[PDB]
Amino acid sequence: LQFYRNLGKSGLRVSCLGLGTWVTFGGQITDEMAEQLMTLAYDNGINLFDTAEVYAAGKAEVVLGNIIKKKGWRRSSLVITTKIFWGGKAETERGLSRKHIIEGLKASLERLQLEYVDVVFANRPDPNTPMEETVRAMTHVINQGMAMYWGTSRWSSMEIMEAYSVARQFNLTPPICEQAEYHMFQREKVEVQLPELFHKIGVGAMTWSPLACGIVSGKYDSGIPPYSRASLKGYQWLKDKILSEEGRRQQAKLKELQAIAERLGCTLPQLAIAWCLRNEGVSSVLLGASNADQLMENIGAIQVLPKLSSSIIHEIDSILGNKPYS
Amino acid sequence: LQFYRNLGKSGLRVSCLGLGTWVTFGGQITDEMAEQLMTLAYDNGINLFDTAEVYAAGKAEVVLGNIIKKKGWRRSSLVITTKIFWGGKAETERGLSRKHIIEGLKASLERLQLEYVDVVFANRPDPNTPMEETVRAMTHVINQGMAMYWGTSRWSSMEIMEAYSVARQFNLTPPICEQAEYHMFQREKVEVQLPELFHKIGVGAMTWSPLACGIVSGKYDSGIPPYSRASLKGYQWLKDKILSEEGRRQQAKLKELQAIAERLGCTLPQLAIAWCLRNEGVSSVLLGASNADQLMENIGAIQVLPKLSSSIIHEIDSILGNKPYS
Amino acid sequence: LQFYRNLGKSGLRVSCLGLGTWVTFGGQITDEMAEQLMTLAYDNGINLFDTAEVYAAGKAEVVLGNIIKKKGWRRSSLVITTKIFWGGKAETERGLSRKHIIEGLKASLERLQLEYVDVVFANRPDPNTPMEETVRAMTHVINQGMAMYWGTSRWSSMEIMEAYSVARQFNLTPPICEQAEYHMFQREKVEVQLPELFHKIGVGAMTWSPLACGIVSGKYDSGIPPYSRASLKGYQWLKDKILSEEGRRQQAKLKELQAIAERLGCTLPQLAIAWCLRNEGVSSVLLGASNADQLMENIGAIQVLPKLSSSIIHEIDSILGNKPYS
Amino acid sequence: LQFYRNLGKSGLRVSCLGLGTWVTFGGQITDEMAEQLMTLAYDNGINLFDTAEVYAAGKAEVVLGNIIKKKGWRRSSLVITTKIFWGGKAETERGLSRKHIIEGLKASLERLQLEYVDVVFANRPDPNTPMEETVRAMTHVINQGMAMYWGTSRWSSMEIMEAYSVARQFNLTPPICEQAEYHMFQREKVEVQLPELFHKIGVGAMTWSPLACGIVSGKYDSGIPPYSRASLKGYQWLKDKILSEEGRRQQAKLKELQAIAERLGCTLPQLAIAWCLRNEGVSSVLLGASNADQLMENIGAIQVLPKLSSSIIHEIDSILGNKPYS
Amino acid sequence: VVINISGLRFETQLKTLCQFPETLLGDPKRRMRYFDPLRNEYFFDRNRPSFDAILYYYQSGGRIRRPVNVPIDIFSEEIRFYQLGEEAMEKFREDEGFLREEERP
Amino acid sequence: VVINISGLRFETQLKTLCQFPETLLGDPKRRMRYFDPLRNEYFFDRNRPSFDAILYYYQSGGRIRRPVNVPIDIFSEEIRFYQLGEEAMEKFREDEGFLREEERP
Ligand SMILES: NC(=O)c1ccc[n+]([C@@H]2O[C@H](COP(=O)([O-])OP(=O)(O)OC[C@H]3O[C@@H](n4cnc5c(N)ncnc54)[C@H](OP(=O)(O)O)[C@@H]3O)[C@@H](O)[C@H]2O)c1
Ligand SMILES: NC(=O)c1ccc[n+]([C@@H]2O[C@H](COP(=O)([O-])OP(=O)(O)OC[C@H]3O[C@@H](n4cnc5c(N)ncnc54)[C@H](OP(=O)(O)O)[C@@H]3O)[C@@H](O)[C@H]2O)c1
Ligand SMILES: NC(=O)c1ccc[n+]([C@@H]2O[C@H](COP(=O)([O-])OP(=O)(O)OC[C@H]3O[C@@H](n4cnc5c(N)ncnc54)[C@H](OP(=O)(O)O)[C@@H]3O)[C@@H](O)[C@H]2O)c1
Ligand SMILES: NC(=O)c1ccc[n+]([C@@H]2O[C@H](COP(=O)([O-])OP(=O)(O)OC[C@H]3O[C@@H](n4cnc5c(N)ncnc54)[C@H](OP(=O)(O)O)[C@@H]3O)[C@@H](O)[C@H]2O)c1
């Protein structure tokens, strides 16, 4: 329906698709494909761009900050996020302490060459640091000007409620968003838990990896194609999930959904992206592409969403069968 | 009565007339008429100068910041305001979010070449952004030094009371003023609503467009004079309000008030400006002029106010007949 | 008794005498006498130096900031104060608003060439500005680093209690001191009112003009000596207070106290300074001198204080007779 | 057990040994031995480095800041502390006032050439300054960015509870640590008092001088060796504690503990360091060395700790006999 | 809205007080002199336990009780001070049992 | 959790309210419309002294009292509003002595 929607109940207006960053930027794909990938995504209305400080050991940000410096886009028209967690080998360089949030955002604001990011994310929950230190540290970088909002990522629905009860007590700022994984085979958290937080306290949801790193892309039925994600080093954990019997059963479940894709005049990635956007409790979907012909067919999946009637939803549920108990 | 009065219950002392800025500055009139218009207004005791960031697409501020840089006036003797709302084509460049208030005031503090404005105004209410984000954002730019006070504009009397109940809860700063339209044909809000807020919470009133963009100026009886406001492009909405039967009925009501102007040794703009200043619930009136001979006759309308007895008020009410139900 | 005492109940340690600044610095005396006056006062243990922004129309600070720049004293060993009130002809340049405290301290931190003063004083109470604006403005300049403490001057004992009930409510900083006039002929406020505030809330007292601008100095019995304070322009109000019958009655009361001065091996200024220091509710006395031979006899009045027994106090009370009703 | 443990309940992860700084750095040992002493301690996993502003009259920091500037270590991998108390001859240059914490940390951030220290310590309690001023001053330097945490040193267990009841009232930051002396002959405070604060409010313990300035090092049985600590000037108070009968009785108690050292394949300093680390209520031990062969045998005392069974603890208690009454 | 009866915080909605738009608390020009713009509340220096039955009169929609501790000469003043009207004053009458005297023919 | 009964702050644990997972306060979808995300509390505009015996019902584990000041037609509505159930409604019955009528054969 709406293209530009609010991030939860905050004032940030994000595009419903957002170009992410992983192994592609600074790693797998080159630097000229990266500048090509951003200019044909920014021109199609997408303003939300993600990164972190663990991607490519701090090289995914230098290839992202060089594009915006060269292309000359206004900073007021973009939304740049950044996650903080593992960015060092030392002991005092990974965590959600006050020393790492203030230093990690300051060092990742020179690789991006900016002056502030829009949202700064806590990449995973820290059990050693108390919750009062992480809420006080994220409010300090907002008030110094280094960010505008903050949000959690991979936190449970109890630790988001715990980092809100602290912020409403010490007069600090609560989080505005949450990054939770969401596709057709991991739909537990964003369907039964996060829609209750959106009505209670008003956090959003910014789902990541909607194609399960290319598993739902349908390229993994006959084996491993060359120059794919699983054919790179460090991704044996991905390849052992599709070579196993559990992944091939999902590949057996992808054959019937292939038939529902061609019925609606689309392909299977264009269904799986627009399947995530069928709700109102999801505020944006973080995409990912390796070349230009992958991306422009993914942005085209907005028009698939008005074709997504209640009948096609109700029988996709029959093929998957992993509807969570509500 | 008093020339320099307080802005509501705050500590800011403003002149009761203040030179505004619209289509004139940077648009209609030239740049040499603009520097002439400010030096013969600052020398007559007026210190309050208004602008915004939507006027002339961000060119009304460059012609205002160049005058104060050239004329060499002390910054401590002036009061410069600025409104924030529409200042971009993008989606994340118009609103009252935290991202636009902090960026829009920072970009409009380079076109003015200053270091801080005195009041920063919210130009119209935003329904998407919650009230806690706009009060927290306006308190952030005050504490960083980029402003001194803040106020609302075109907000209802409920959303000013809502942006005060938040500020007294989270220990933030409430607004000090409100810009509401006020002339002889729009006198509803500033007469029955805003005098109740001045006694309850202590906001002021800074009325804008006292001549209804030249309608009360008496130049629009025989048609459209050349080089007027209605004769410019983008002002068909003004011209269709005076060519309609509703505006000509107001022109029929301006013929009798023309007779009351010459009785008191003044003209009809000098009555209409001093008619607004007859209260104590109005703290300043924002003027507007196109040339020097328009302005010096408007500043002269201070002395008309001690001639404004209760008899002339009570029969001007009979000619207009739009006295609101109290 | 003790030389370096606390300023009230704060942590600031001030010398019990402090060299002030008025008509002498930048006005009456020259600039070479001024540098001579500071180096022979700083070497005798006095660290507290006063100024304001109305003295010599902003020239008493340029002659004070040039000495510390030239002599090369460490900033951590001094205590420099500054009062804010009248420092401009305009309407928005005098008051205790948020616009004048932030601008007046910033402009008076370039004439002093420092980065921060120690105490910033409100020179007289403002009836137009509400108390919540002046406490919020003085807490803003402390948190920005431009000052360290703040205090009131010429405020009544109710408006110091009102600027404390606000600061303990909105979580701001209360004042630490108060400048009240104190000599043998004005001893009402510092004896019956300010010792109750020192026990209740913990403010101090920093008395000013202990010789009543040279009236108690004994030089004004036979008339006006040349090159005195009363012989300068703008001081007719002083001269009409000593030429009147009321001042000559005080001169009649100074003849007997002249006899008590020579009994204790001192002169009459050395008694009147040490008469003020006989309490514990007074934390410092702000001196004032015109040449070197005036000052070194005034700093010597510390040793007169252990000679001040209860008998000499009880009969000085008999000569003056203005003991306030306790 | 664990090498890198949390500092109390905060998020700071410190090594259980930390190289301190006293008479050695900038004083006794040279500058080339100092750079040698840090590089062979940083390479063994120790990141916690201590200093203050009274050591060598402000020269222990210039020799510490020059090493990190030259060696090129990342600031995010270190933990640098600093204590504030006596750093001037003047009266307003020693204390825990707001004027000395803000100035003393700013001047000690140019001798270290850093931009922020990790913990800033209050070196001893101040009875003149109220507790609300010291908690407000330490929260001001944290929020300005000049530090990250703060802690107390030599404060009693009541003044740490008093500087916590204030911080939880005015919405400030409580301390996270406490430096208390701890060895075999001063074990009162860290064994019966500070383990109650770790469970109640969550402060840590960072013990200093574990060898009692070389008394437990076993070099002081036959007299004073040359080039020792007691053989330097200004350390007569140390020499009169080992030449007295009380210290020789401790030397009589060191002869039996010499026998327990060789039984476990270690020397007596390697026992005394690992004796302090046997608890969980102690978060780090601040070492001290004069040359390289002293230090590398002290870092080796980690492996002595798993040999420290309950039997060797229970009979070391029999030799000393100063077990506090629990 | 927040009402502070000499230290006790009573906090109810605005539409509850607007059910009776003729009383003290219902009229936005009569209660406006008891405002406190520093704490955003109305401060009355009245008896503490007598307001627990005044607020329940607005919430229930017309019923008048009397708490057990407050005597009758005290609770008859709070109905006179909050200007509840003679309709509410006579509803307090037969709740205490004392019926008013009938008009003579 | 914090419950704000028209100005009076009651603050209990979450596992106390989860002992009775069918009432108003026990069901996280029925009490969710009374939340207040600015102060992090639940705001009910009900009678003040009647909730002191509702909260003790959860804390003690099932007992129902009645405070002395609140009458029976008031306290019978708070059990109906907080949806304590007929088990708790009939436990309020014989506590007041009034036994229900037996079913005729
Ligand atoms: N907060 C966290 O903890 C966290 C952690 C990890 C990632 N993330 C975010 O998640 C975002 C999404 O990353 P993702 O790569 O996992 O999302 P994804 O959409 O599930 O992965 C897409 C991958 O499949 C391929 N692909 C996309 N469309 C295709 C199409 N039509 N046909 C064939 N192949 C197609 C692409 O190249 P290939 O064919 O070469 O595979 C791409 O690499 C990342 O950018 C990152 O910002 C967040
Ligand atoms: N907060 C908001 O949302 C908002 C929105 C809009 C404007 N404003 C403020 O309102 C302020 C007032 O603007 P305005 O122009 O609408 O006020 P105005 O006084 O009603 O308009 C005066 C216009 O009429 C003409 N005029 C003035 N005196 C005259 C006289 N004696 N005889 C003949 N013509 C005369 C002038 O030139 P012409 O004859 O050529 O017309 C001028 O353009 C603006 O400066 C702006 O700061 C605020
Ligand atoms: N907070 C406020 O509102 C406020 C207002 C005004 C002043 N103040 C402070 O008050 C401070 C004190 O100023 P003040 O001049 O009025 O104090 P003062 O001690 O009463 O005046 C001393 C004057 O008398 C003369 N004098 C001093 N000792 C003398 C001696 N042994 N023999 C003969 N003459 C002697 C000096 O030169 P002469 O002989 O030439 O007179 C000097 O000018 C000022 O520095 C200012 O900082 C504060
Ligand atoms: N917060 C406070 O108030 C405060 C006050 C004072 C100190 N401190 C901290 O305490 C820290 C520890 O200082 P410290 O010197 O007193 O600790 P220490 O470990 O008790 O003293 C060790 C001294 O003994 C010698 N030594 C060490 N190991 C030895 C070994 N195996 N064999 C022979 N000699 C050995 C060393 O050289 P020598 O043989 O030449 O003696 C060294 O000088 C300081 O760095 C400082 O940061 C804190």
Numbering used by the authors:
A (entry chain C), B (entry chain A), C (entry chain G), D (entry chain E): 36 to 361
E (entry chain B), F (entry chain D): 106 to 210
Any passages from the paper?
The H451N mutant exhibited 60-fold faster inactivation (τh = 7 ms) than KV1.3 (τh = 440 ms). We determined the cryo-EM structure of the H451N-mutant hKV1.3–KVβ2.1 complex and obtained an overall resolution of 3.3 Å. The main differences between these two structures are in the selectivity filter. The external part of the mutant’s filter is dilated. In hKV1.3’s structure, the carbonyl oxygen atoms of G446, Y447, and G448 in diagonally opposed subunits are 4.8, 5.0, and 8.6 Å apart, which widen to 6.7, 8.0, and 11.6 Å in the mutant, respectively. Moreover, the carbonyl groups of G446 and Y447 rotate and cause their carbonyl oxygen atoms to deviate from the central axis of the pore. The deviated carbonyl oxygen atoms contribute to the breakdown of K+ coordination at sites 1 and 2. There is no density at site 2, while the density at site 1 is stronger than that at sites 3 and 4. In the mutant, inter-subunit N451–D449 and W436–N451 interactions dominated, with occasional formation of intra-subunit W436–D449 pairs.
Voltage-gated potassium channels (KV) play vital roles in electrically excitable and non-excitable cells. KV1.3 was the first ion channel discovered in immune cells three decades ago2 and exhibited only C-type inactivation. In summary, we report the cryo-EM structures of human lymphocyte KV1.3 channel and a rapidly inactivating mutant H451N. In these two structures, the VSD is in a depolarized conformation and the inner gate is open.
